[PDB]
Design a protein around this ligand. Structure first.
Ligand SMILES: CC(C)CCN([C@@H](C(=O)NO)C(C)C)S(=O)(=O)c1ccc2ccccc2c1
Ligand SMILES: CC(C)CCN([C@@H](C(=O)NO)C(C)C)S(=O)(=O)c1ccc2ccccc2c1
Ligand SMILES: CC(C)CCN([C@@H](C(=O)NO)C(C)C)S(=O)(=O)c1ccc2ccccc2c1
Ligand SMILES: CC(C)CCN([C@@H](C(=O)NO)C(C)C)S(=O)(=O)c1ccc2ccccc2c1
Ligand SMILES: [Ca+2]
Ligand SMILES: [Ca+2]
Ligand SMILES: [Ca+2]
Ligand SMILES: [Ca+2]
Ligand SMILES: [Ca+2]
Ligand SMILES: [Ca+2]
Ligand SMILES: [Ca+2]
Ligand SMILES: [Ca+2]
Ligand SMILES: [Ca+2]
Ligand SMILES: [Ca+2]
Ligand SMILES: [Ca+2]
Ligand SMILES: [Ca+2]
Ligand SMILES: [Ca+2]
Ligand SMILES: [Ca+2]
Ligand SMILES: [Zn+2]
Ligand SMILES: [Zn+2]
Ligand SMILES: [Zn+2]
Ligand SMILES: [Zn+2]
Ligand SMILES: [Zn+2]
Ligand SMILES: [Zn+2]
Ligand SMILES: [Zn+2]
Ligand SMILES: [Zn+2]
Lengths: 166, 166, 166, 166
């Protein structure tokens, strides 16, 4: 027999993601680089591995949308809600949605896609928000021009372990 | 930091259920009998007890539906997905949904509602799938042809690991 | 070439319906009789014909549900919203949903399924609400213990014609 | 009584569009060029003009999406449904959605975005499907292999029946 796990977490270390569509705001290459770096934040401190799929169903489906986009969490135009992601699970579990009524960037202007995506993928992997104001998972955006804070390291390792500590 | 903790078991032994709607495929009394027997599989071997409510909110809300039916885990027409249930917890926790594009039966012409529901309620109570091919919680449907059902030992051990014996 | 029609209406006279699931409140036969009579209200004054399908995709998919049930119009528990239906069109177009937190009846008590369904199927066929307080499509429920009012006759015939006037 | 009247044409000749997001399959500039050319098919033969907006609400909102994407007209994975568009009117009226489980191309390897979009925008402007197999508005996709596209006479006549000649 099997009882359920104690937390929402992926039961496998090899996870896939797919960039379903792209923002007008950045080139395809810049978006890809941002998401690759954002996953690396987490793979650098766990045994997780992330691979990109170009098509089909990936664990973590990433998309840009506005207003109603296929779930119970419609976006709200400029400002306000920026992005959301579902905890580990089937179907929409893991998926990350970005509000394209925001301006996404690879700079200090607008919202830096890398930084916001790194937070979103924390949710995709099983972290909720933190009360540590220095944490990546603290739900207030501050631009930094990157080292994963220790609160986030401790949280993600509580779920997956550290992987190679080197 | 925070994770998304799972409720590993119901913290009360007296649970309620409600049959929100009914399949075209069986009479009301047939459906009621199937679900009553499916709960009894589990209450017979633990301290759990189940009470039916006719109105309002119950711990285990049971419904029949097709395609997209309110949780963004859509069903898929005949065959494939049969049913799904949520693990213990508030709101959708415990609830069980049956794909009415299947043919539900009190016998063998289609999927036996009692047997499928008994498996679903295992999930509602905290059991994941078993790897024992003879277990109720094994995720391949078979039918013995016999008028009596005996809960396999693997399932007895699993549910008693959570709730103890009756 | 073809431009679109001037109103939302079915472009065919042979329409199908499917009772996807059933209320706890009434027997299957009573529900079927109510819906058959409710369609007859409209077929008696137009060239429309209604046939019931037991499975598969019908034009008018009828279901009973509560709270979130797969669209943008969640139900609201007892009282308040009773039912809604979509105007003619593909997919959910035509479909009729009944809130099973109401008590549906074949009497003067609760909400008479026949009477409410007859109004809902007016929507399914292309009528919005009327300002004639005597109309079936007036959106306030009154029990009657049936003759389709003339405002509704005029409205439905404006879309489909009268069929056989005998 | 009231029916659900359709808007048979836009009542202004100056329309706006917005490309809300972008397919992985083509560069931003390729997508922009395809949509610009698709609008020009129609503006070249009528008094219509089209202006691109980068932010906010536009008459014709264009997006790429997969599966359930916010309107309960879900896409279906590769092949089958390609795209859909809403007829003239407020809110979703005019908007066009492209299934990104298709491969969109500037050429012939997949579905040519320009050609499919030109058909979609015919719907956005008030045209239904043609029965002429040589029409742009005929709902079977073919590709000529030629570098130039000429709007067929059937489509010219259809769109000019609504808006007149340019
Ligand atoms: C008031 C708070 C709870 C609302 C948070 N927002 C949402 C959030 O935490 N998304 O992950 C929440 C409504 C689910 S947010 O859209 O403002 C947001 C999104 C991504 C972020 C990434 C880094 C830093 C802050 C962020 C804030
Ligand atoms: C590929 C497998 C894991 C998919 C299982 N299926 C679902 C399930 O285990 N539901 O409890 C799974 C997608 C969550 S199933 O719908 O095929 C199903 C449902 C009830 C069953 C009851 C008894 C026996 C088999 C069953 C199979
Ligand atoms: C305040 C009004 C507009 C809300 C109407 N209601 C809804 C309606 O007209 N459904 O057809 C409306 C929210 C779309 S209702 O649920 O109260 C309702 C439903 C069926 C009915 C059938 C016969 C008579 C009245 C009815 C009222
Ligand atoms: C069975 C048919 C009516 C389904 C049409 N399809 C849809 C359509 O006509 N969209 O404009 C229909 C379901 C609303 S389609 O997705 O196969 C499609 C879409 C764009 C097209 C553009 C050019 C040529 C063909 C096309 C076919
Ligand atoms: Ca690692
Ligand atoms: Ca926003
Ligand atoms: Ca997912
Ligand atoms: Ca943007
Ligand atoms: Ca199924
Ligand atoms: Ca529940
Ligand atoms: Ca069925
Ligand atoms: Ca008739
Ligand atoms: Ca209600
Ligand atoms: Ca329908
Ligand atoms: Ca009821
Ligand atoms: Ca498709
Ligand atoms: Ca629009
Ligand atoms: Ca694509
Ligand atoms: Zn979302
Ligand atoms: Zn967050
Ligand atoms: Zn469900
Ligand atoms: Zn299962
Ligand atoms: Zn509904
Ligand atoms: Zn109404
Ligand atoms: Zn759409
Ligand atoms: Zn079309």
């Amino acid at each position: 027999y099997n009882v359920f796990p104690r937390t929402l977490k992926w039961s496998k270390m090899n996870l896939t993601y797919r960039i379903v569509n792209y923002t007008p705001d950045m080139t395809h290459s810049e978006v890809e680089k941002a998401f690759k770096k954002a996953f690396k934040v987490w793979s650098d401190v766990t045994p997780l591995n992330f691979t990109r799929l170009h098509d089909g169903i990936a664990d973590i489906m990433i998309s840009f949308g506005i207003k109603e986009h296929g779930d119970f969490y419609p976006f709200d135009g400029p400002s306000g809600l920026l992005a959301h992601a579902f905890p580990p699970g089937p179907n929409y579990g893991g998926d990350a949605h970005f509000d394209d009524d925001e301006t996404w960037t690879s700079s200090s202007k607008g919202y830096n896609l890398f930084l916001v995506a790194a937070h979103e993928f924390g949710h995709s992997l099983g972290l909720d928000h933190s009360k540590d104001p220095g944490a990546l998972m603290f739900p207030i955006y501050t631009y930094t021009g990157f080292m994963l804070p220790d609160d986030d390291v401790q949280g993600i390792q509580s779920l997956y372990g550290p992987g190679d500590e080197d």
